[PDB]
Design a protein around this ligand. Structure first.
Ligand SMILES: Cc1ncc(C[n+]2c([C@@H](O)CCC(=O)O)sc(CCOP(=O)(O)OP(=O)(O)O)c2C)c(N)n1
Ligand SMILES: Cc1ncc(C[n+]2c([C@@H](O)CCC(=O)O)sc(CCOP(=O)(O)OP(=O)(O)O)c2C)c(N)n1
Ligand SMILES: Cc1ncc(C[n+]2c([C@@H](O)CCC(=O)O)sc(CCOP(=O)(O)OP(=O)(O)O)c2C)c(N)n1
Ligand SMILES: [Mn+2]
Ligand SMILES: [Mn+2]
Ligand SMILES: [Mn+2]
Lengths: 556, 556, 556
């Protein structure tokens, strides 16, 4: 009975069990206590392995893979604060639905709370943020392999969304040659080793029922609000709202084509709010709405019913309207609730939206971040994807641009953390294999700076644009107090990113006008590598331009 | 009444109350929901304020500040994944005793679990890792200020060691001019506002009693094992063990002067373990023992009694010996259990330690990480301090060098994370104001790379040595399997740090020999700035040198 | 601004919201802090109010009501240990699926952890046993009513099974005349007050999909195992299994009619185990299987697939077979996977089941608890229901009796507690309004003795048989060691229950033979009251009779 070999057999059951649920990507950080998991994973031909040294970035890389591939993605981490570093991506996964399977190696129970090295209390350490939590017991052959596979199978089979914490204790010795210890224990699973299915299949589906009065409600004056959803869903929602004759308010994340662009501007005009007051129903598809004027309009509107359709559980209306919360795949839901062609009821809003867009176009020339947001459609890679950072860039793109229907957009908009954007973008790119444009601010680029290491391995060109406005200039847009603003809010770091790019041998451009930026992009798309494009802009020009456009459009 | 003004009144009671328990340093990350806290702290003249954009590094900076100053240190963070980024530093503080007061802003209860932006479930999210957890209620004048101050006074007054999680929800609006809202509510505390005492003084001391049979046990054949303690404590333990005539096995962190150096080597010799089989009592002062040979000996020794004296709570002997766990300040404990002058009882071990040290001396010439560790005592800044990173650097110094008694050594050996060493070193430096030598591995430097921003501001010279052996070479010291070792264990990142240093305008040196290294050091100690010294070494030389010195010393 | 009036309005929103999710029965215990809830409930005409002074019994009465009604049942309790007494029924509800809504009054946050009277920490006190937990905030007008109703609507709407803990803090004053305070706040909800729907409808349904290979599996050699389910599902499962030609092993709780009765005896016969080895699939419907021989058979059998179909979630196979865990209403599942008539495949089992029952019939004469169990069908009230206690009674009825198909049987077989059987039986009776036969052991009756107060109010005759064998004679059946058995296992209490019955003015009988038992029953059914029939039997005769019938049946 070799402890090291049985630790290995136990782990091989866990990992092989994961392969029966769609886990193909596994992200691994270095460690000693995780050896049984890591070796089980390395010897398993089902996995694509990714490696990173920073477990917070490691968690965000897994999140980007899961976000893009829609599979569960596994993560192996050693014991101690490495486990803690998984918290941010786990939090975000719990909010937006990515299936992250966290395999956290642990010390055995005899080494907890007694001053041993790198030993901490890990069961329950993520509180209520995992969808399921499994605390595996100390490995022993007195517990049959069928229990372990069944525990794993219950956890993955019943997972509608979000992360799973699987705490895996192992006693030393961890190293040593494999002998037959644990082989007959494994062989009790019979030909399951050669199968493609779970040992225990427990796969209940969670779905709201068809709404049987939809045919009554679809004849009313409605509004469609389109939040985060897949690209194909964005197209279906566009055609659906058009057939209904209802105005479609489309988020940067919808991929609807935003037929009423610049909603964050024209929702500031009283003609629009007044016309919107006639809506008897709002059907919102998807969630995590971006614009401030749209969030305020949602919070103040009083339709007879407010419906939110999404495949993520729980309340999604922060204004708590009377209405419905419908759990469904958005495309399936539209098939169950089809549109009948009806005469459009909005007259003032389309003209207002065209005028707002025309006001933004009048201001496209200055070499600023507001204009980059407005012109961003001109730089999207062909057959590619966009990853949009948090803070001002997602706001400016939402307010000032009209992104094309069905062009894929990704984001970390569950909790809107600025802590894992580059590594998430690296997962997005690796999962799809498509050329990727990722836009972030300077504080966001500094936060996840070491994720530049990951960006040295992309399967297609990735352009990382860093808008360097010297601090978090979102706090120049909000009414922060002037005396404390720079030190306690903006926090300018007075850096450039040329040396960061050279450190990881990434191409770098710092364009000074539109022609140089166009040159930078045309060069960058030429090879499967990451290019850093730094846009240096005056600190507050973007926030001020957005405010001025808000006032201008509110007086139309 | 004005909600924004009352929010800042509530927060001002919180912050001012912290000043009554020794809180001097406040570390602040940027955010909007944190406005009541941040402005309350910014207006309070009692505080020194530190800022940073990454909350993980922000927490470790507070950890270094508390580590040196031995005072509670406060942290202000906004809602969301920013709070989760504090987990590693909080875990380490829960293990080594630093008192971190985490003030985490939150959305109001009506905005949890409903799709609001940057809103997550925050009460309890650090599980059992905080020493105290307080979930403040939604601010209201119906709860009197005396309750609020009493709650904080209870948490800080009864805080023996570890972190305090204080979750502070605030409702909008957050911005707006201060009016008289909440003024009379505040004035119900009377002249407490001008006092230096807590509103409620609750400060019970936790201490083991004098051991009344100490006069019996100090005459037996004893061994002193010295772990982490303060520099003063290290010298007092050295004199105490010498007076007892007991061998002193001194850790790199003990500051005892290590009168029997290279214990990680000579404890591998059968003559030493055989002599140590005669010990009737082991008195260990401090914890987090570093060396492998010392851990194995502690694990195998069978004295009649094993005592651990430390000012942190809980079990600290991972081999679970029969004996005593004594909670005390080590200097106080030595005073209560004084030595008596007795004849030394070990004869073979001193001869053995001299031989091991000479075997190390014979190999001092090669320009390697083993040799840098052995020679580090020749490079300590006068009246300075040493910060030792984790992985090989602390083990090689521990095994191969003899650090001078009473020279302050700092580290993160609670959980031995490699995730916050640079920001912790910045805090260590800022708290003491002393010149600082910090030594870390390359992966450790990559993990906390953006902490170089913090190192742009030190009050005295800081030398950061980055030992670049291209990966985590601890996994060349351990018997990791050869085929998986590089991809899944070592993870070489093939980088240098000249561009990192250049990005943050730090002086940089890449010495190629001893003479260039001493030139680098002589230059660096001249100004109050950080100098980055990259020592490029061959990947596996350090690990092999250590293994050969172990074998050689085993055969003496 | 009246605090007592607003407390009442907040509570009235909670209680009215509960009426929209089917809550009709509400169980109330006395208290002062619960006043806002209790008075809101007393004013609401939608409710049937039940009262009891023991909150443990109060929790089990609610469990019995919910068990019968198939509707969420509310409970109101005051602050302190009253809340803790709810734990047993809450745990059982989490195992068998009853929806108990626990409204636990609490002190406000300013009175927790400060030495106030009857104030304890109540959020989270039921750990993971509730399906949902809500910690309501301190009541205030600044949190809108639509939030409070939405929070409850989410909790009740997404509740598939089990209890909900809603902690309701209230500040003083609690008493005082209703003025206008909070009226306009309530009025925000508009005509929701005159509506019969939730404010927010969130009712996603969890169900496994059709098994698309069922047409293959239903023509194999299968076994049907019938656990706990409804009376109607019992009849449909019987007809289904008969049509398939599969042997039906039916539990006491199945109401299948047990066409192969005395399985706890004939599964001890080697011919049966050998014949059932031929089974290629087991489909189990329901769970909480009773018989020891059936649990051992399940644990040892090795069909190709093992399926458990039930309306509750989670793993239900304690032997962790390879197979399927199918979440469904059992009747819906049967219509989705219909039987086609095929010839029976078992040859030995029908004769052996007939023989086993005939061996029981041979021993029916003695006036013992085994024979009472075997003859219990002779005493079932027409158009009534049976409540079976735990320990020996349920096993003896399972092993020795053949209960009619579709005759309702109720029990507390989730955790098999003996702590709330009389108050559960009282709830079963009150919710259905039907005449009831409840059978319990003496220690179970002592445990819940004050529940006789509840049994003074039944809407139809309830007969309570107490089998008094002087202690827990289950431990004479189990191989407990003889020397410790009486003091530490059996614990005879040497009591009778005539004075118990007299205390609560219930008719009482102690029959000495079958004619006297018949006479006692004939008297008891004449009025809508509770009758106590104590059957005094020799301590170990039941266990001995069961053992001997097992041996006899194994030698067939
Ligand atoms: C991990 C963490 N910790 C702190 C924060 C707080 N926080 C923000 C949220 O407030 C805004 C998101 C949102 O609400 O949707 S934005 C922001 C500044 C970003 O600076 P930048 O990259 O330079 O971009 P810029 O502002 O355009 O100039 C910070 C520091 C956070 N989000 N995440
Ligand atoms: C946050 C976190 N996550 C992962 C680990 C696992 N872990 C280690 C534990 O074995 C620590 C040992 C020790 O006890 O000191 S060491 C180690 C390698 C460090 O590489 P380096 O800096 O380049 O230095 P070198 O090895 O000397 O070459 C890692 C990656 C961790 N400790 N903390
Ligand atoms: C609250 C709690 N605490 C303790 C127990 C343990 N426990 C039992 C479980 O082992 C068995 C339940 C079952 O499986 O059905 S049975 C049992 C004896 C009951 O005595 P009885 O009424 O006199 O009946 P008789 O045994 O037939 O003579 C006890 C004391 C419990 N169940 N619940
Ligand atoms: Mn910025
Ligand atoms: Mn290294
Ligand atoms: Mn009994």
């Amino acid at each position: 009975m070799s402890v090291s070999a049985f630790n290995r057999r136990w782990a091989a059951v866990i990992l092989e069990a994961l392969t029966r649920h769609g886990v193909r990507h596994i992200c691994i950080a270095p460690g000693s206590r995780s050896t049984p998991l890591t070796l089980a994973a390395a010897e398993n031909s089902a996995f694509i392995h990714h490696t990173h040294f920073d477990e917070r970035g490691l968690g965000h890389l897994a999140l980007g893979l899961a976000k893009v591939s829609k599979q569960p993605v596994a993560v192996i981490v050693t014991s101690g604060t490495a486990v803690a570093n998984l918290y941010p991506a786990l939090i975000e996964a719990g909010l937006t639905g990515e299936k992250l399977i966290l395999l956290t190696a642990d010390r055995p129970p005899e080494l907890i709370d007694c001053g041993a090295n790198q030993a901490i209390r890990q069961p329950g350490m993520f509180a209520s943020h995992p969808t399921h939590s499994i605390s595996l017991p100390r490995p022993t052959q007195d517990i049959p392999a069928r229990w372990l596979v069944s525990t794993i199978d219950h956890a993955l089979g019943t997972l509608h969304a979000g992360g799973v914490h699987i705490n895996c204790p192992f006693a030393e010795p961890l190293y040593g040659e494999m002998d037959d210890t644990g082989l007959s224990w494994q062989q009790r699973l019979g030909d399951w080793w050669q199968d493609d299915k779970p040992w225990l299949r427990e796969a209940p589906r969670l779905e709201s029922e068809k709404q049987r009065d939809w045919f009554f409600w679809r004849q009313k004056r409605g509004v469609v609000v389109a939040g985060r959803m897949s690209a194909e869903e964005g197209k279906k929602v566009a055609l659906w709202a058009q057939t209904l004759g209802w105005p479609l308010i489309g988020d940067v994340l919808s991929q609807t084509g935003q037929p009423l662009p610049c909603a964050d501007l024209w929702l500031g005009n009283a003609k629009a709010t007044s016309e919107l007051q006639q809506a008897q129903i709002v059907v919102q598809l998807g969630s995590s709405l971006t614009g401030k004027r749209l969030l305020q309009w949602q919070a103040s509107c009083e339709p007879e019913e407010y419906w939110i359709v999404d495949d993520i559980e729980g309340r999604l209306d922060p204004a708590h309207h009377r209405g419905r919360r419908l759990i469904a795949n958005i495309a399936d839901w539209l098939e169950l609730h089809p549109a009948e062609k009806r005469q459009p009821w909005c007259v003032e809003i389309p003209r207002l939206a065209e005028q707002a867009m025309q006001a933004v176009i009048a201001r496209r020339d200055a070499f600023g971040e507001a204009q980059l947001a407005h012109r961003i459609c001109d730089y999207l890679p062909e057959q590619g994807q966009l990853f949009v950072g948090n803070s001002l860039v997602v706001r400016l793109i939402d307010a000032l641009s009209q992104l094309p229907a069905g062009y894929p957009v990704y984001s970390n908009k569950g909790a809107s953390g600025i802590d894992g954007l580059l590594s998430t973008a690296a997962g997005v790119q690796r999962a799809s294999g498509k050329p990727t444009l990722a836009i972030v601010g300077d504080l966001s680029a500094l936060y996840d700076l070491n994720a530049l290491a990951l960006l040295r391995q992309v399967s297609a060109p990735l352009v990382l644009i860093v808008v360097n406005n010297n601090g978090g200039q979102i706090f120049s847009l909000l009414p922060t107090p002037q005396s404390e603003r720079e030190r306690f809010y903006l926090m300018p770091q007075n850096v450039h990113f040329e040396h960061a790019a050279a450190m990881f041998e990434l191409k770098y451009h710092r364009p000074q006008n539109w022609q140089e930026l166009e040159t930078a992009f045309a060069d960058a798309w030429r090879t499967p590598t990451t290019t850093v494009i730094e846009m240096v802009v005056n600190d507050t020009d973007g926030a001020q331009t957005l405010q001025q456009l808000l006032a201008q459009v509110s007086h139309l």
